[PDB]
Ligand binder design. Structure first.
Ligand SMILES: NC(=O)N[C@@H](CC(=O)O)C(=O)O
Ligand SMILES: NC(=O)N[C@@H](CC(=O)O)C(=O)O
Ligand SMILES: [Zn+2]
Ligand SMILES: [Zn+2]
Ligand SMILES: [Zn+2]
Ligand SMILES: [Zn+2]
Lengths: 362, 362
């Protein structure tokens, strides 16, 4: 007997198109999404060219409309030069992404004053997400309060970070956050097996105490999001390994295993992969869309999943219980038992739907 | 220029059918809902007969399907005799309602052991809401922890209650809550004008400090809900006045006034009248459904609103800014500038929709 879930949403993926299409493209990344029970993705802007102005966004929109197999929204990225220039296209994006630490990106902001400028000029009703680690979480929360608006913290990975966010929420501050599966299911104990190249990720893998702190503070976690960050094995094992793990195809099976073990409820999972993503990013419903999962099937994660061009996974050898059997997207069968059945281009930009615009005061 | 909102949801209404149809019926109450920008309502079970067993639910379903103009779900009510008997129909209801204090209801539970029995026998994946005032909020939270599940607190009205819920949320406990408009916009200062009959409501009107505490702790409030509780003026002004205010037609105009004054944001309002109702009660989206409001129009609340059979309102004479211009429900114009344009019976039971069932483990 299968369980029917709504269409799940991943608010943090890297689809690498344009400019890194040997790692992933819209067609291969959205195939990975559908196979992981994900029917809508929000794509980060750290591509080549990065999505930091209107021409780059226009190019990315057309590439996604032609290649995506599931529905999507595209983030804009903050730069040292584009504050105050995005007003005409801001509403067409998933939100604005601030890169506040070192990671796979050249979108460096090197002064808090630049963060302030973005918080002041970006329209106040639209989402802002931040790559902000350790004390940077406190710093960006300060900038959000100075400018009297909300912020969403990407991939929280540490006891320090989740407890700071917990304290902010207790004071009534408008902050939300997401946690990626590798920070719930991997730790320092796995670095010997992975090695220093494969093991490179930002935020880095945490201690066992970090992992335990995230589970203990699940009530503080608003969303799960994969931070699907594909790189080839050659790149991961080469002289200057880029950080990041692929994760779309393994996220839901890992979390279904935890549900089966009683670590969180099915509702806890659906809040964090459906309802809270919808409400934080004002993402629209998807008509006639659902995911059927088999919670009984036991299997072991192989050395690579079928669809991501990354062609490797850090979860190799983990035993999971739960698998995606079928996905229906807007009335068409999109995935069944390892076969993707919608072509590149089937997916649409949800911000162009009338119900996908963020409401605002005139 | 109008602002387009999604279809708003009121998780706490009394439609009085069956058995009190001089006060309201499905047709008049859902007309009031549409005029207030509400496209989906959850109807409480304290009717005559009350909805406390399968035959009563079956009757109510048919009355609602024939009379409702907007979509709906129907609560079941807990009684001193029906714990352990609702399993076959539980999934067809909005949730289970516990009456834990004195109010317009004979569904008295007179022992905490009866509360325990309901929390243990009601399916653990389905909603429970509680009428629980003052220390009763702490008591029902204790029962929820003993039985390891969530609870939703109806119409929070006091500083004492919102601060207790705030403390529970800080400890990670699964509790949500709703606040009704009369507890944000009326107080003891209005009791002289209303008089002792009209002024009767449960929870009673609060002090100015109670009202200020609710606004200061808006981050703790998950939902707004009208607690639309219609009684005729004759009843309100007679020898034994029943408690309750009508509120569907005045809720959104009052809150839009507050938005216009900067007391909360448009997003704050849509979280509390759309996204959080959806996610707490697992309510489905409504296709091709939206509400158009005019935020500029200034007007004064009259002595009665056009649609509710209550034919009175406690907000008479309050100046508001904001009004509902048009409502579209599932592709049909349902309301325009004071005219309801869908007939009784247009509305549907959302728990019969495939997307309206609450997901559960097999
Ligand atoms: N997380 C990573 O380690 N890498 C991400 C970037 C990011 O999310 O910071 C990537 O784009 O490769
Ligand atoms: N709130 C009230 O004062 N009355 C409600 C019942 C309730 O919500 O307790 C009614 O049904 O009249
Ligand atoms: Zn990042
Ligand atoms: Zn990322
Ligand atoms: Zn009540
Ligand atoms: Zn009520």
């Amino acid at each position: 007997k299968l369980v029917r879930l709504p269409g799940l949403i991943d608010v943090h993926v890297h689809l690498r198109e344009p400019g890194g299409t040997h790692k992933e493209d819209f067609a291969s990344g959205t195939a990975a999404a559908l196979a992981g029970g994900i029917t809508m993705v929000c794509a980060m802007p750290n591509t080549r060219p990065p999505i930091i102005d209107a021409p780059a966004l226009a190019l990315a929109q057309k590439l996604a409309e032609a290649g995506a197999r599931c529905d999507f929204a595209l983030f804009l990225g903050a730069s040292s030069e584009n504050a105050g220039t995005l007003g005409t296209v801001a509403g067409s994006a998933a939100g604005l992404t601030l890169y506040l630490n070192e990671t796979f990106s050249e979108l460096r902001l090197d002064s808090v004053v630049q963060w302030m400028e973005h918080f002041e000029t970006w329209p106040s009703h639209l989402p802002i997400v931040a790559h902000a680690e350790q004390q940077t979480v406190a710093a960006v929360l300060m900038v959000a309060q100075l400018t009297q608006r909300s912020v969403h913290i990407c991939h929280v990975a540490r006891k320090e970070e989740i407890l700071l966010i917990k304290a902010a929420k207790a004071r009534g501050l408008p902050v939300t956050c997401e946690v990626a599966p590798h920070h719930l299911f991997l730790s320092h104990d796995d670095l010997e097996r992975l090695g220093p190249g494969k093991g490179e990720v930002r935020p880095e893998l945490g201690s066992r105490q970090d992992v335990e702190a995230l589970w203990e503070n699940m009530a503080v976690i608003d969303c799960f999001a994969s931070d699907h960050a594909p790189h080839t094995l050659e790149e991961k094992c080469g002289s200057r390994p880029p950080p990041g793990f692929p994760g779309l195809e393994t996220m839901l099976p890992l979390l279904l295993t935890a549900v089966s073990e009683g670590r969180l409820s099915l509702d806890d999972l659906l809040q964090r992969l459906h309802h809270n993503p919808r409400r934080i990013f004002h993402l629209p419903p998807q008509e006639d869309t659902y995911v059927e999962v088999d919670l009984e099937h036991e299997w072991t994660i192989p050395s690579h999943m079928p669809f991501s061009k990354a062609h490797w996974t850090p979860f190799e050898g983990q035993k999971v219980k739960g698998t995606v059997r079928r996905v229906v997207l807007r009335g068409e069968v999109a995935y069944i038992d390892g076969q993707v059945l919608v072509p590149p281009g089937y997916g649409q930009d949800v911000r162009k739907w009338p119900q996908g615009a963020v409401p605002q005061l005139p």
